[PDB]
Amino acid sequence: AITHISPLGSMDMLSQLEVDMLKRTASSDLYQLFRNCSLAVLNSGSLTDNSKELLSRFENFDINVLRRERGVKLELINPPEEAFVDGRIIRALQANLFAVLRDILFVYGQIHNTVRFPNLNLDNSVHITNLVFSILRNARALHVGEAPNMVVCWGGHSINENEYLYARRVGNQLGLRELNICTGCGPGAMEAPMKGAAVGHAQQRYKDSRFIGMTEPSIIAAEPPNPLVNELIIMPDIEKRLEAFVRIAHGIIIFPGGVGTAEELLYLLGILMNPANKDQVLPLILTGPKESADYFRVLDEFVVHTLGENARRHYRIIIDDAAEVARQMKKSMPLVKENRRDTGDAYSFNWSMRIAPDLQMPFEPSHENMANLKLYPDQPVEVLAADLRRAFSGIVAGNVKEVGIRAIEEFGPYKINGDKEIMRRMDDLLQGFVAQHRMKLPGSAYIPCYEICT
Amino acid sequence: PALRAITHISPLGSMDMLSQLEVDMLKRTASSDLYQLFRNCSLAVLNSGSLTDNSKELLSRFENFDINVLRRERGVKLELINPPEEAFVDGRIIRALQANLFAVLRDILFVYGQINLDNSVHITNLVFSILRNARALHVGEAPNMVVCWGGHSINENEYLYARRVGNQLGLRELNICTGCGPGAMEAPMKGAAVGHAQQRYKDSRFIGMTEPSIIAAEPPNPLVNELIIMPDIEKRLEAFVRIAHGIIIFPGGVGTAEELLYLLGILMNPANKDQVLPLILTGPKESADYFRVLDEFVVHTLGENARRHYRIIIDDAAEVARQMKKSMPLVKENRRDTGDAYSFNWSMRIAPDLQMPFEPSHENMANLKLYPDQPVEVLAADLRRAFSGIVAGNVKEVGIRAIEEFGPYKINGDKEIMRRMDDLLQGFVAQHRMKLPGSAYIPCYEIC
Amino acid sequence: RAITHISPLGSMDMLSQLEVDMLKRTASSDLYQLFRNCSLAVLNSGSLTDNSKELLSRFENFDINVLRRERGVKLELINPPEEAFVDGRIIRALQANLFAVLRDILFVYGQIHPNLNLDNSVHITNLVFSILRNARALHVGEAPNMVVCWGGHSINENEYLYARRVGNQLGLRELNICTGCGPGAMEAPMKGAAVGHAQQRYKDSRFIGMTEPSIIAAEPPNPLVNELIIMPDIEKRLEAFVRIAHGIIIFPGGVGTAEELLYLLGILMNPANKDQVLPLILTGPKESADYFRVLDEFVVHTLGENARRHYRIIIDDAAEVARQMKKSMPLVKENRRDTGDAYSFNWSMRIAPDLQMPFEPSHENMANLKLYPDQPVEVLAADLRRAFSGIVAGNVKEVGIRAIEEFGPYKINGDKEIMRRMDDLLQGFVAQHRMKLYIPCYEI
Amino acid sequence: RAITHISPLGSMDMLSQLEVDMLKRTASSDLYQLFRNCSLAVLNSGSLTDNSKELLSRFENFDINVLRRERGVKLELINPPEEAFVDGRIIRALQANLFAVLRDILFVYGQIHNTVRFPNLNLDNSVHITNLVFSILRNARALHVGEAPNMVVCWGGHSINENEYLYARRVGNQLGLRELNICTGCGPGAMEAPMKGAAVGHAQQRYKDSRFIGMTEPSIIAAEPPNPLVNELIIMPDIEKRLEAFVRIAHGIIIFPGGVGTAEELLYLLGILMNPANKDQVLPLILTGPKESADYFRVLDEFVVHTLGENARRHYRIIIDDAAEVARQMKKSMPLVKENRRDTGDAYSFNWSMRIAPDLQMPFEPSHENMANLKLYPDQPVEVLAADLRRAFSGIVAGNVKEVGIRAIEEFGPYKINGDKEIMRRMDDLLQGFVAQHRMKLPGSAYIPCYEIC
Numbered sequence A: 001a002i003t004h005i006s007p008l009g010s011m012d013m014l015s016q017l018e019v020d021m022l023k024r025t026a027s028s029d030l031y032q033l034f035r036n037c038s039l040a041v042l043n044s045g046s047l048t049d050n051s052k053e054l055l056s057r058f059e060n061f062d063i064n065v066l067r068r069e070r071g072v073k074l075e076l077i078n079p080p081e082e083a084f085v086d087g088r089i090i091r092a093l094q095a096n097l098f099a100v101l102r103d104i105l106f107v108y109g110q111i112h113n114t115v116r117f118p119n120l121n122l123d124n125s126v127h128i129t130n131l132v133f134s135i136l137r138n139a140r141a142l143h144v145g146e147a148p149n150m151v152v153c154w155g156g157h158s159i160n161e162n163e164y165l166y167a168r169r170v171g172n173q174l175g176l177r178e179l180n181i182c183t184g185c186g187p188g189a190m191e192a193p194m195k196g197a198a199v200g201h202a203q204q205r206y207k208d209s210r211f212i213g214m215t216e217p218s219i220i221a222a223e224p225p226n227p228l229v230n231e232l233i234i235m236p237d238i239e240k241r242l243e244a245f246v247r248i249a250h251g252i253i254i255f256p257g258g259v260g261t262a263e264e265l266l267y268l269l270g271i272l273m274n275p276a277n278k279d280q281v282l283p284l285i286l287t288g289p290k291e292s293a294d295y296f297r298v299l300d301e302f303v304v305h306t307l308g309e310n311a312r313r314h315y316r317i318i319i320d321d322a323a324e325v326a327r328q329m330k331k332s333m334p335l336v337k338e339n340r341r342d343t344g345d346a347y348s349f350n351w352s353m354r355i356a357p358d359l360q361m362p363f364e365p366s367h368e369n370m371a372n373l374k375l376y377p378d379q380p381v382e383v384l385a386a387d388l389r390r391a392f393s394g395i396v397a398g399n400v401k402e403v404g405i406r407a408i409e410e411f412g413p414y415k416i417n418g419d420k421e422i423m424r425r426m427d428d429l430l431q432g433f434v435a436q437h438r439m440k441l442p443g444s445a446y447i448p449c450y451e452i453c454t
Numbered sequence B: 001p002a003l004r005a006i007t008h009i010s011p012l013g014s015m016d017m018l019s020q021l022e023v024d025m026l027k028r029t030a031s032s033d034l035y036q037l038f039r040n041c042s043l044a045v046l047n048s049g050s051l052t053d054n055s056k057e058l059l060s061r062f063e064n065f066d067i068n069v070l071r072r073e074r075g076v077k078l079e080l081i082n083p084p085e086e087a088f089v090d091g092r093i094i095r096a097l098q099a100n101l102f103a104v105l106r107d108i109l110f111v112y113g114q115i116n117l118d119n120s121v122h123i124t125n126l127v128f129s130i131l132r133n134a135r136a137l138h139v140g141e142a143p144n145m146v147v148c149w150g151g152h153s154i155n156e157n158e159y160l161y162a163r164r165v166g167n168q169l170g171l172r173e174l175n176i177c178t179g180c181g182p183g184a185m186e187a188p189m190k191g192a193a194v195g196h197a198q199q200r201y202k203d204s205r206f207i208g209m210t211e212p213s214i215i216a217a218e219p220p221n222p223l224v225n226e227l228i229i230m231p232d233i234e235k236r237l238e239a240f241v242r243i244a245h246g247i248i249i250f251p252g253g254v255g256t257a258e259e260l261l262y263l264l265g266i267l268m269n270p271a272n273k274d275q276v277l278p279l280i281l282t283g284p285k286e287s288a289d290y291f292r293v294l295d296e297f298v299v300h301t302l303g304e305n306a307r308r309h310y311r312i313i314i315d316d317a318a319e320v321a322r323q324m325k326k327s328m329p330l331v332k333e334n335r336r337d338t339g340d341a342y343s344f345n346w347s348m349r350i351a352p353d354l355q356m357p358f359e360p361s362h363e364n365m366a367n368l369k370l371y372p373d374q375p376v377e378v379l380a381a382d383l384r385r386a387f388s389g390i391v392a393g394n395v396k397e398v399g400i401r402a403i404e405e406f407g408p409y410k411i412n413g414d415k416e417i418m419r420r421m422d423d424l425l426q427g428f429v430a431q432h433r434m435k436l437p438g439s440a441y442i443p444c445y446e447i448c
Numbered sequence C: 001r002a003i004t005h006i007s008p009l010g011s012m013d014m015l016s017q018l019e020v021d022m023l024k025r026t027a028s029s030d031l032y033q034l035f036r037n038c039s040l041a042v043l044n045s046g047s048l049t050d051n052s053k054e055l056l057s058r059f060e061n062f063d064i065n066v067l068r069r070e071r072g073v074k075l076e077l078i079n080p081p082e083e084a085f086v087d088g089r090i091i092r093a094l095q096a097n098l099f100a101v102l103r104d105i106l107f108v109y110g111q112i113h114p115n116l117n118l119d120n121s122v123h124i125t126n127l128v129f130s131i132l133r134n135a136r137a138l139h140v141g142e143a144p145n146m147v148v149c150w151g152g153h154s155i156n157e158n159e160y161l162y163a164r165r166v167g168n169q170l171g172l173r174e175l176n177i178c179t180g181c182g183p184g185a186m187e188a189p190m191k192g193a194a195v196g197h198a199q200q201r202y203k204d205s206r207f208i209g210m211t212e213p214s215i216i217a218a219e220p221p222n223p224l225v226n227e228l229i230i231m232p233d234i235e236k237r238l239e240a241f242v243r244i245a246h247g248i249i250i251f252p253g254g255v256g257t258a259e260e261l262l263y264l265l266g267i268l269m270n271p272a273n274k275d276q277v278l279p280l281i282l283t284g285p286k287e288s289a290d291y292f293r294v295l296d297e298f299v300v301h302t303l304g305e306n307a308r309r310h311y312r313i314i315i316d317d318a319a320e321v322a323r324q325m326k327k328s329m330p331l332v333k334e335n336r337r338d339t340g341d342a343y344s345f346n347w348s349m350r351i352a353p354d355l356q357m358p359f360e361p362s363h364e365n366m367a368n369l370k371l372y373p374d375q376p377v378e379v380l381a382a383d384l385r386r387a388f389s390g391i392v393a394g395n396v397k398e399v400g401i402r403a404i405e406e407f408g409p410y411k412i413n414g415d416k417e418i419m420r421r422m423d424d425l426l427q428g429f430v431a432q433h434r435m436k437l438y439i440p441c442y443e444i
Numbered sequence D: 001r002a003i004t005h006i007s008p009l010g011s012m013d014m015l016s017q018l019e020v021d022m023l024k025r026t027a028s029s030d031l032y033q034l035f036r037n038c039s040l041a042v043l044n045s046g047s048l049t050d051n052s053k054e055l056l057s058r059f060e061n062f063d064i065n066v067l068r069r070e071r072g073v074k075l076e077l078i079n080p081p082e083e084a085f086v087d088g089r090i091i092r093a094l095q096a097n098l099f100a101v102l103r104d105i106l107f108v109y110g111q112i113h114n115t116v117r118f119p120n121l122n123l124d125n126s127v128h129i130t131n132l133v134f135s136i137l138r139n140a141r142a143l144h145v146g147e148a149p150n151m152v153v154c155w156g157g158h159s160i161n162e163n164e165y166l167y168a169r170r171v172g173n174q175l176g177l178r179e180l181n182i183c184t185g186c187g188p189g190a191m192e193a194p195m196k197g198a199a200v201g202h203a204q205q206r207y208k209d210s211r212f213i214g215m216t217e218p219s220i221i222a223a224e225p226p227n228p229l230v231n232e233l234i235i236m237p238d239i240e241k242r243l244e245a246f247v248r249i250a251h252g253i254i255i256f257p258g259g260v261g262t263a264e265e266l267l268y269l270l271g272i273l274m275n276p277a278n279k280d281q282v283l284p285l286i287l288t289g290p291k292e293s294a295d296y297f298r299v300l301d302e303f304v305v306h307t308l309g310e311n312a313r314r315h316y317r318i319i320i321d322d323a324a325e326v327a328r329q330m331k332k333s334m335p336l337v338k339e340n341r342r343d344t345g346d347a348y349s350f351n352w353s354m355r356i357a358p359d360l361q362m363p364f365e366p367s368h369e370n371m372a373n374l375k376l377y378p379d380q381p382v383e384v385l386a387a388d389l390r391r392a393f394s395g396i397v398a399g400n401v402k403e404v405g406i407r408a409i410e411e412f413g414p415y416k417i418n419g420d421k422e423i424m425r426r427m428d429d430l431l432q433g434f435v436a437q438h439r440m441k442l443p444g445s446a447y448i449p450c451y452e453i454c
């Protein structure tokens, strides 16, 4: 079974040298990744328990890039049947298919292994930001003149029915207020709010739904985007994905997501508490069903007792009140618009927010690096927030990730230079997630895997 | 003036360019004795989407609701006093409810305010004029409207199946028209919504076609984006059949049986021997018996020739939709061949028997000629009335009062048809199709 | 001989069988000649001939039938003018006007002649609205921007150019144009406004041509009009003009312009309309100064310096004309917001019944007019205009000339000074060569 | 106020911060005079001044600044012509052309010169030129995806009489009545009349997608304001790329009388249409004018037939004084163009498969040694002789009428052309016939032919 797909929504106006480039990249060591992402996209919304095994059902699927005088076509070999309706590919899959071609072959292929974009220095913090903007602009995701209304939703890939219901309700309440949704693109909390918002949009006869799925190559290669997504963007790596979330967001909503939730909040506080960002407007709301109350309590307790009472100027917790979450998002859009007008910033992309270069770069949780963290109350709060994220991420990896356990077994616990008040707060928070089964440790009791010294 | 929740709504989707004489009429009608009907239909619309069971959720909880027509130089506004709170988002009415509110004003107040309705030519002209008034007949649109009939009370198995058919229909960019109620009248619209989104189809038309005795006690489902209320069931049925390019029938009760008999009554009329109107009866695998029974009852009373006009498809949602889509070019060509319009099937002949409004009085119920010696169309017309009266006696204020004053309808006829019809209804009652869950149904008919 | 079939465009595209039956019978009636002549005139739009009568005279073998096809209507054209077709396809502009004739001549005009009382003032106004609504000419929500332009159908190159400049300046400000739809001043503002729209990337050009069955049956609409509306008589056309306008610009138009100005002043000086916002500007090139001065001198002296509350004269300043119009649009929007009125159709303007009715200058009608400075000012104007139709007809129109020669002078009953101003005006127009013949047909 | 700020319209509205910095930098370079003069020519569009060089001198105190904002760019105009403004606001059409000037003068120059450090040594320069031309058109948003062919290119004199002007306008009206769009060199004269008529015809057909493309180059527009009908201004980097762009976006070409340059124009097209690689291409070419041009075209027709062969008439058609027929032929050709692009899989909006010889993308300096290395012999491949005859014409003419040419002829003598005698005779008969039609005017009164066989 072989079918030729023409472009839709992207990759529809290429030069002959660009197509030449695309064909070369498709024949590179990148093919496997390109093929797995394109397979992921074609399996979107195919109901399945385990998605890793679903893709392992189409091992005879392949994809070639076809050259034509006018540009590019896609050749699908043994594609999933469910992606076709009386022989024609379903339009939504077709557009996501060409977003994968765009972001994996055209962008990622000129970045991975060697940077071929002329004069791009990926070690340069301004270049990075301009790249993230170029990717989003290339994806046609930044509209000229559009008044702000994009709400980014973060939260667990794997969540229970209560949480999925509540998140769906928030999205429905955002939908009834004509707000748009951007998420990480996968299942769980990344899907429920879009599903809700789609119902809301229909009720308000709102015809410009933007459901933005912002992912990255390692993830989309194994996880089909959820079926609500109608604007797929694959950023080159997780640091750039996070910067993209921040810069397109007009508001951020965090649902529960395990330990990662606290890492996300610390990243945001590290940005939002930088004195350079004291005049930015970016509403941040943490919200769950009534059963997540103690989950957000320990989190909020850890933030205040390490970063201070001022931390609460920047985030607000709301338990089981979907309508009030959306109501507050909706009310803040006009303030975000004024804030953008105030600095002459763009409505669709927040240029003026300062994201420190360390927040753009990866962090290796080695014993050396773990050691260099200055976890002391006398540090600038935005630096301490940042270092706290690094340390929390390292302690948890040392418990749950095999590359982290490997480091601990080989070299013993991490040596942490920190105030023991701060480090106690951390053990409370870690203990909290273990007790609440939000953190599931291999084996039994919670392992410190760290020690407070030099 | 007591403390009350108040809002003014401007016209949306209709009633936005009125003359001052027209507005004057609206205000007069709105204060006439039609007010209760107008007020109950407006309340039902404002309860679209809530999950409680109707009647007990309607007038009961909103006794303090009222609605006034407001006059302005430019036109009309609606004033809502104590409307249901969930109809509003931060104080502003949800747009789909708003459009439905003004369809109610258009069809209850404006369409009556201007209303020989005994002449078949005038009935059809009236049905056309209402449809056109509602902006429901698109000039140029190629055929793609599918009418779906089915039970208001169905199980999850049946609901999910009809959703699947709906999705398969929306994946083929077909539009849906239903009776606008819950159950099988909602599930295919839910599915088609998902399919239209998957295809980036931007012209979803979800037509909800009801009538005032029904809408007054059954809110429209939340998918309906084009509410139309015809003046009676007869005109509801004629509208359904004039705008359909294909019809799909899911398992239902008497309302769906009334629609089937009505339809066979038109399709077996020799005057329509050359009409193209694909008709598919479908359900999940668990409904194989339902359709066995229903097909036997049709063949017994109307003859094996009835099967020229429908096809039963059990548990195959993709194949139902594929056949519907495959027929749209045949419908277009048939319209071209007979000089007809694409949006409104003028060629179909609907006999007076099936057009003349039927009052479900005990007198008229006892007088139906349900005997095997009538011509096929005639018998179909009379079975249509028999089911129509059972609907009224179950769900309508006129018929419910008629039952609680004179007892159950007595239906007589050929004992062989009567047995078939008695067992069919015991199936509907057994299968929980007569009424929604909560309290055992009490038959308003007595078959002898 | 040469036969083509035309599908509907912009109207009459969604008809009931009863309606199509009706159209076919009406086309078969003694109406058919008017229906045929208006259709022929539409099809001759934008032709390059000097006489409209000699042009429409060479199409003797042209005819038109109403067909039923696909349950709607098609127009059968027999021997139509070839200039109306491109490679066999009718030009869309002409096509839409053609079905506008069908709409307003056969479907409206044919059918008015149920509970409709054409003598009832409120019915008249609701009819005009209905005809406009039916022509899809009243947009919901649309911010005011429609400027009505009045002026002579026959004007010199200098007046045409000026009116084109006013049109350009109006279009550069994104204002739309409604004229009586013929040539001359009814055409130049539209020509100019289209150029200005283009420079502003303005895409929603509305050029409404509002006419009446006797006019268009002999005068092809100009090629700029893109919304043709045929009102049933001159009185309903005048009301239509007033009710859709957001401002009005009057160009030179001979002595008719005096009737025009009196009509509007009869409406604007009516105390009932004291809070109405309707900018009125009179304007022409430098050569029109004397003409507008004598006009202004007649108005102030018969109706008082108060009449100047309701108009402004601007000589040879196109930008300033359009500038004022543009600046008024928000005041009109606010005025409608405040009375709860429609933006597209001014319901609250009071038009006195007598102004919705015709007037035959019979000596008896002439003599019932009360031309006294004692009359209410709104009434004196309505009668002053009526006395103008008569005196001028009884100087230039044969039926009125023969009436003065075969029945006496019109023998009016008016103040001496009122009448004297009238001769001043007519003598002024006669002396300026604006009105070409002066015999005062009155008596006092 | 004497100073006003303009926001982007129609282009230049979604810029990165690195792009804006590069714009500000280019604007401060020795490009500024060129950028300023083009911006001023644009604001003067539609001025009723005879000499458009005198008109651009009365603005000695005009200047323009590129303004940086967080979100993008604005233009700062200093003493702009007041006619470009309505009640203080720039007329939208001038505003869009103003940012087309910024796009093609500053940004396209800047995108040039941001190349790779390791360029592909196997890439023909001709392939780059063609792909660059495409890139410029794509960047101007000038190539629509999926649009059916309907672009007619019109060439002809910038200075023409009443009678020629009205004819070109009727041709335009007839084109528009058939819903064809117009592209010209955007000056006045025959470059304006066809758009004027086309607009009228568009209004009569309720065609609301008018595309009036003016394709120019920075030397022309710096001196000559664009005509007021143009609604898509494109400025190609030089005259050769402007010629290639004309050929590549055209679906048909109409040539009006234009003095003796018209002969150059026709030889350019013949050099392409008669190339053997283009034998299957579909590109209707029509020469047309009023009755009074029949001799002008009969002269051109005889030179082509007698130097390139009667077969040259397989590629153009002459039509005198039938405007409806011209338009009728083009309209009928449009579906043949569509089918031709569909057959090859070429783009509807850009003709990639047409072969344009590399010599035709390169400029020609009419030096004596260059004039001598032209091989004007009939045993030359026809497409090459067409090209060399074209180089020969520009040189001989420039020698007879252009200052720098007449001066070089006086210093180093007459041009020493090696070529067949009959050919040079046919060339002479053309130049004579033009001067004798007064279609060609040479300093003095005696046409003294400035060449000499060898």
Ligand SMILES: Nc1nc2c(ncn2[C@@H]2O[C@H](COP(=O)(O)OP(=O)(O)OP(=O)(O)O)[C@@H](OP(=O)(O)OP(=O)(O)O)[C@H]2O)c(=O)[nH]1
Residues within 6 Å of the ligand: A144, A145, A146, A340, A341, A342, A343, A344, A345, A346, A347, A348, D007, D069, D071, D074
């Ligand atoms: N900051 C910002 N402005 C944007 C954006 N998109 C459009 N705009 C508009 O660009 C205009 C900027 O205002 P200007 O008057 O030209 O100049 P400034 O106010 O000094 O701002 P600036 O120096 O450029 O940063 C406003 O329109 P108006 O002038 O018509 O006033 P309105 O807002 O009512 O629509 C903005 O609405 C955007 O993405 N970011």
Ligand SMILES: Nc1nc2c(ncn2[C@@H]2O[C@H](COP(=O)(O)OP(=O)(O)OP(=O)(O)O)[C@@H](OP(=O)(O)OP(=O)(O)O)[C@H]2O)c(=O)[nH]1
Residues within 6 Å of the ligand: B008, B010, B072, B074, B077, C140, C141, C142, C336, C337, C338, C339, C340, C341, C342, C343, C344
């Ligand atoms: N007078 C008038 N109003 C019109 C017209 N078309 C729409 N409208 C709108 O009708 C709406 C009335 O809504 P309300 O504000 O709730 O009522 P009121 O303002 O008190 O006036 P009303 O009682 O109806 O006479 C206004 O919209 P918004 O409230 O959202 O205000 P906007 O869009 O301007 O921002 C008007 O703008 C029209 O042709 N004439």
Ligand SMILES: Nc1nc2c(ncn2[C@@H]2O[C@H](COP(=O)(O)OP(=O)(O)OP(=O)(O)O)[C@@H](OP(=O)(O)OP(=O)(O)O)[C@H]2O)c(=O)[nH]1
Residues within 6 Å of the ligand: A004, A006, A068, A070, A073, D145, D146, D147, D341, D342, D343, D344, D345, D346, D347, D348, D349
């Ligand atoms: N050559 C060309 N085609 C274009 C262009 N823009 C859109 N198309 C369409 O892209 C599709 C490609 O052709 P295919 O259907 O895939 O069949 P092929 O003959 O094999 O073309 P190919 O070999 O790939 O070049 C066609 O649409 P459909 O498949 O839907 O058929 P339709 O438009 O008729 O409804 C073309 O009409 C263009 O600029 N140039």
Ligand SMILES: O=P(O)(O)OC[C@H]1O[C@H](O)[C@H](O)[C@@H]1O
Residues within 6 Å of the ligand: B148, B149, B150, B151, B152, B153, B178, B179, B180, B181, B185, B214, B251, B252, B253, B254, B255, B256, B257, B259, B433, B434
């Ligand atoms: O009587 P039932 O068949 O159970 O359901 C009633 C509805 O069934 C049909 O679709 C009609 O639309 C009815 O409103």
Ligand SMILES: Nc1nc2[nH]cnc2c(=O)[nH]1
Residues within 6 Å of the ligand: A153, A154, A155, A156, A157, A183, A184, A190, A238, A241, A242, A257, A264
């Ligand atoms: N990169 C990233 N993906 C997510 N998915 C859900 N939540 C998040 C988040 O906070 N960051």
Ligand SMILES: Nc1nc2[nH]cnc2c(=O)[nH]1
Residues within 6 Å of the ligand: C149, C150, C151, C152, C153, C179, C180, C181, C186, C234, C237, C238, C260
């Ligand atoms: N009814 C009417 N028609 C006109 N046509 C041109 N001018 C006018 C005018 O002033 N009134």
Ligand SMILES: Nc1nc2[nH]cnc2c(=O)[nH]1
Residues within 6 Å of the ligand: D154, D155, D156, D157, D158, D184, D185, D191, D239, D242, D243, D258, D265
């Ligand atoms: N580049 C270019 N511009 C023109 N303007 C008019 N004619 C021409 C032509 O033949 N080539």
